[PDB]
Amino acid sequence: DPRLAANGLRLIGLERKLKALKARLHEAEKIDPEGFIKELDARVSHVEGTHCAKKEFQCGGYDQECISDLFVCDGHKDCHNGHDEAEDVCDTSPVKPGNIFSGTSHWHDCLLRSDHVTRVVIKGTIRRNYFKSRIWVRAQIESDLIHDGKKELSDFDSKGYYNFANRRLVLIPIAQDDKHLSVICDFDRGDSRRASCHRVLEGTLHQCANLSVHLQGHH
């Protein structure tokens, strides 16, 4: 064995290296350039606003064409550039059943709670083939309250819709007169994983709490 042994050592080295790189993958996944830019595009676009009316959908990013939000993701090309039927626009995964969005609820009205976890749990979706403009969502709203020294879950069943055009999930409490506030989430972070939410009164849309959920998801 001349320097064949040396080459063997080199090979052990390469094995070690490969192991290390594979380890680096976990840390590499924590960086999403494309997603970062999509987020910034979202936030900047929010600061810009639009020239469209309420209940209207602006076609491109720079584009000047407006469309009724009743025509967004309905299966028909309504924009001169077809943006209203684009895949990013029409992505149905913000309300894919099984999704569990969790976040901290910060109250500043209505209720006198300290900061606490809230989960929006997507339980089901209906999308009529004759009206694809909206997805009808059913979900469970859970809240971990450390009310009286000990912990207690406060949950309720709710129903509403996800509207593609403004990327908004509205959930009002199913037959829950019992002073459970509605929730309104905007998937305005460039993805289908995070949303800026509020606990609101259904009738007036008055915001009683600030809530920011991320998907995390798995109990």
Next chain:
Amino acid sequence: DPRLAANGLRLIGLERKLKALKARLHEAEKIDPEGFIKELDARVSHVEGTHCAKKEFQCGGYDQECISDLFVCDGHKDCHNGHDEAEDVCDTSPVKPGNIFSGTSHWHDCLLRSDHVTRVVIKGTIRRNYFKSRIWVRAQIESDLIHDGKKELSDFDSKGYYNFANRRLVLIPIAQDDKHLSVICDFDRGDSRRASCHRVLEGTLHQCANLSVHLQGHH
């Protein structure tokens, strides 16, 4: 010395490799992609012809504008795209004095010589600043003739011009009534290194020999 020695062996390996690559450079220089494509462009463009008159210079490659060849490389932008003053067009190196173009002369008229070496030796150039359209070239034409069992040099002094527009070097024999034929070279191979030449009669431009010179150059 643990595996430090092994790493040392690796380093000797890398040294060896580097030496080998440096050796490959010579062979790598024998490949000129850009020059190859420039040659093909030249040859194809010759097969295509142009829509310009004689004594005219077509501007771009696809471009439709024609210009008098008295305006080519004269210091004034005459083409809508300035091609008549471009660097490739106005390159003066085909007739840079010191250049020695060598090639094989193949006779088929006038003289009864067998195939033989000819050299065009650029001896001087004059380029008037008041008329840059042309370069006035003075050169020596040498021919190695194996006439009567032994070798003998047949050389003569000559004068003419290089015209940029048609990339043509014309050399007629300086006061050489002594049946020395003129030479006309076209640098039509995409470079300033090779030329397609002819030995011709000055008065009639009748082609007595085919000659293809390349630069090689250094005696």
Next chain:
Amino acid sequence: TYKDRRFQYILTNQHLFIDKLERDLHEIDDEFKKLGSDVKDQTVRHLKARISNLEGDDCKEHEAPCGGDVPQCISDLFFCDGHKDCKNGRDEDKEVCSEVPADIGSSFAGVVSWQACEEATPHHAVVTITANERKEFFKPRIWVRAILAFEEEEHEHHIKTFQLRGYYSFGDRTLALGPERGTKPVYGVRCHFDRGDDDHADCQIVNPASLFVCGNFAAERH
């Protein structure tokens, strides 16, 4: 022999080890490729441009920013005139002074939302530079002849065409167009190339007199 087969045995399973390593490497690389990708440089350029526009500048009328690390404002009339007026020379930068937005044959098109003048629904507008002239003694402007045309239905067959003349201003990054000599003051155009390149512009179809906005289109170079 036997020793030969031992040596060959060592060689054989070093190549085997190398092959395994190669396979593992391919697994890891494949795992890395499923982490999305990097971003289109145009998307980043445009995003940065939108941010820059939202940030604005402290320039006065008839001034434009030089750009760069230390903000400085200089005159419209000082951009691309061969003398460096910016502390960082940006007013003579080769990119800033790109004369491409005013090149002959340049055409910028997009769909128009009207607010007056025209009662038609959203259609394309195209403005095409047909001629230009940049005087050598006054270089901060490129004088252009252009044509505004509208996309109209297959049934119309009586298209409307407006001949314009105006200029491109480097510092403003502005193409300003008005009616050609003796041609009925109907329309003018204001295009602002503020997306960070010579290929997109925010245009308004205006009244030549009042600069009143008749309609807007997001222009794109085709």
Next chain:
Amino acid sequence: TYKDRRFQYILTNQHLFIDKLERDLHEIDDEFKKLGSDVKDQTVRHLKARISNLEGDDCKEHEAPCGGDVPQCISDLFFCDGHKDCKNGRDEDKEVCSEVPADIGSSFAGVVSWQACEEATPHHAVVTITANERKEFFKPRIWVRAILAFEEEEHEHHIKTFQLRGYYSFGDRTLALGPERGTKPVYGVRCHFDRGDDDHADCQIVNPASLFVCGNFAAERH
């Protein structure tokens, strides 16, 4: 200690050896960089295109080549209509069926050498697509509305504009334009996109009736 300084002595001049190797590598790489470069893919595409054009095809009138490894000719009327008529399907290739040369806002410009009709000296011509329509039941043609305009001097100020209508044919790779409905049969345009991309075309400004060539320009997309 001493043994420590021996070990450190070995380490020190292995790094030195690595540094030397690095320097030598940089020398060799620098020597390699001075061997010219590779070629622009556009120059190669256009060269290949010019060769292809010089080679021609054995197609009949109203036929166009499918392209590809085994030559086959098919009808004008069979390109990009959703059914594969070529043995290799090329008549439905996504590149062949690029509808970009007929896109709204597309403008092709270049300098014209005239041979009749116009007694002006070489100036630019620009043809701009202002509208289009591709009927879903007859897809092998894109019907277009365009405008031919000429570059004219700063002194003219009475520019000439010709409104055209016609089609783009995929197999022919041809933009064919004639006078718009009721607009004085003065000019027509024939552009052939034969440079291998959607961005350059050989155009002729012709008489709409005789197809007599009035002038030629090498068109380029701006």
Next chain:
Amino acid sequence: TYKDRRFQYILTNQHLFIDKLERDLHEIDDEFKKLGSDVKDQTVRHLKARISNL
């Protein structure tokens, strides 16, 4: 051969080590040169003379 390249490998990076040492020496010497200089013998002679006279 291989042994020849090992011997040459040792030679090569002893010269490299010598070169490094030389560079370091030049650094130190350069650092020493920036400590002013010695004094003109005339300035000292005259100073001593002035003291003597006083």
Next chain:
Amino acid sequence: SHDEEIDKLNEDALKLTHEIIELQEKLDRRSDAKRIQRAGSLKARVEALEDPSCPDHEHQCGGDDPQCVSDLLVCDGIKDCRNGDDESHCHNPFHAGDDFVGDVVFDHCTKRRPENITLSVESISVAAFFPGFPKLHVHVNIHKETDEDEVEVSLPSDAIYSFAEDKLIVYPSEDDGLGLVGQFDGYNFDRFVGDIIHEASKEHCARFIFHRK
């Protein structure tokens, strides 16, 4: 034979080494500290354009679950953010000996109206019991050469750094209300904007862009 095969082995091994280091370089490019920084700076500009997410005197912990925390509680060694953000900012951009050179943007209040200002950090005193607001002793160095004279100045001044606001506050040393405030990008730390403000009117009358020298 026993050399050709070995050489082929060494060759395949080199090529493997190359492919492996290539993967590593992709990994490195993705996580390149400079790139991450630039990203942070961009994000920061956007944040500047948005409405503040926190009350006037609080600090946004950031993250996918935002939270506001008193400015006085940032970098005091006790975690107040649920994500501990208040306790990881804590690297002071200024070290004893650092120089920053600022070039003028606009200026209509300073005495000398200088082209550039050098800010030299001389010392830093961090109270162990109050580490969130380090105190610096710095010198403001100006050198202005007019026609009538040449003036050089080195004004000793006291400063505070706020980790909460990523901000240097340099209290005036002369007899004008003129203080220097350096706002850091949040991610750069080799460049800040130095605004000169009247301690009283709060009027902003000069601005210099400072870079680490």
Next chain:
Amino acid sequence: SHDEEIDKLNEDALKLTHEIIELQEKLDRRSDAKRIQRAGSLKARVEALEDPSCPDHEHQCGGDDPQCVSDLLVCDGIKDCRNGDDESHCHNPFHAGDDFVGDVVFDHCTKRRPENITLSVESISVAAFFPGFPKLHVHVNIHKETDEDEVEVSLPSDAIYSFAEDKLIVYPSEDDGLGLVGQFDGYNFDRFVGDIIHEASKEHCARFIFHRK
């Protein structure tokens, strides 16, 4: 210490290995045999478009110093070109056992009018005293399935390869004047154009594009 430093050494060495192999890969890409071939094919198309550089029965030695040499003197083992070009072509594209499959371009004379033709090389006989024109025994295999019948055929035929013309000439085996001629690109050798020609009228009545199978 004695491990951290060694590891840093191994690392720098790996990175060097990478940079070196990178240079090598540039070198390899430049001289990639396939690329050179494609270049040759392109150049060949151009040459086809140009006027012939040589008399009807001669061979262009090529190079920067062109020369014409009789077709009968190419690949006879004696250098006639000044650059020896006639004696370096000499690699026969056909080997005993090779199959080429040709797809129809046009065809209006063959008996079966087939979709594809397989040409199988069975044997090669090279006269030592005349190596420039190898003789091949090949079989032309056709399989045509119409409505009325299914026909299969394997026609044994004699052929000659001309190195001078880069050309395979397959003499007809049946009772029609129909011969097959395969023209090689000059640089490809995995693809030729197979024209079917009447041995008499010289009329070109069919063409197939053959690829090495």
